[PDB]
Chains A and B, each alone.
Chain A
Amino acid sequence: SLHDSLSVVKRTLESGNVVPGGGCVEAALNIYLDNFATTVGSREQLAIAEFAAALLIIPKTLAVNAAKDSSELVAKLRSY
């Protein structure tokens, strides 16, 4: 078990740059690109809004497979 456990720790440490999971990146880009969409304001503003909102499917499906309500956690996670 120590070899099967540390093996995950090995790859995590081997890369000196780590990213938080669980839907943090998809929500952070959704809120940031929402305000960045106003920096263009012609056409792509609708495309950027749809591109950023499309990232919410990743944290949504993680909650569905976990039996928890996705409409709650994903909405609460974005508000935080």
Chain B
Amino acid sequence: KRALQNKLIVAGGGATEMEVSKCLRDYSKTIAGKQQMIINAFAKALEVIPRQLCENAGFDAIEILNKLRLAHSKGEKWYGVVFETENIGDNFAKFVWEPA
């Protein structure tokens, strides 16, 4: 339903959640003072969404999230968490989509 009603999509399943948390860690480097640790806490608070997705599905939260923090930091922004076979992967190809 939302695919036809909304033509603006973002990659879900951990993809968008990591990119929002990725850039805000870099944006906090330019801001000094208490606001730096607060933005870092906000980006750290964004890590609970991909975490619980792996914990509720039985996947290992330590390995998959850390491996997700690797390849996503390598310059590809679309890496999500594959819900079928446990591994890191692009959800844009796996077609996990949510509107913006």
Chain A positions near chain B (C-beta within 8 angstroms): 38, 41-43, 45-46, 71-72, 75-76, 78-80
Interface residues of B in 13-51 (CB under 8 A from A): 29-34, 36-37
The SS class assigned to the B binding surface is helix
- Distance in angstroms from A32 CB to nearest chain B CB is 14
CA distance in complex: A79, B33 (Å): 9
Contacts of B73 in A (CB 8 A): 38
Chain B residue with minimal CB distance to A45?
Answer: B66
CA distance in complex: A72, B33 (Å): 4
Contacts of A41 in B (CB 8 A): 66-67, 69-70
Task: Flag if A76 contacts B69 (CB, 8 Å).
Answer: no
Task: Flag if A75 contacts B36 (CB, 8 Å).
Answer: yes
Task: Flag if B62 contacts A75 (CB, 8 Å).
Answer: no
Contacts of B36 in A (CB 8 A): 75, 78-79
CA distance in complex: A38, B70 (Å): 6
Knowing A42-B63, A79-B29, say if A72 contacts B34 (CB, 8 Å): yes
CA distance in complex: A78, B66 (Å): 24
Interface pairs A-B: 8 shortest CB-CB: A76-B32, A79-B32, A41-B70, A75-B36, A71-B34, A45-B66, A72-B33, A75-B33
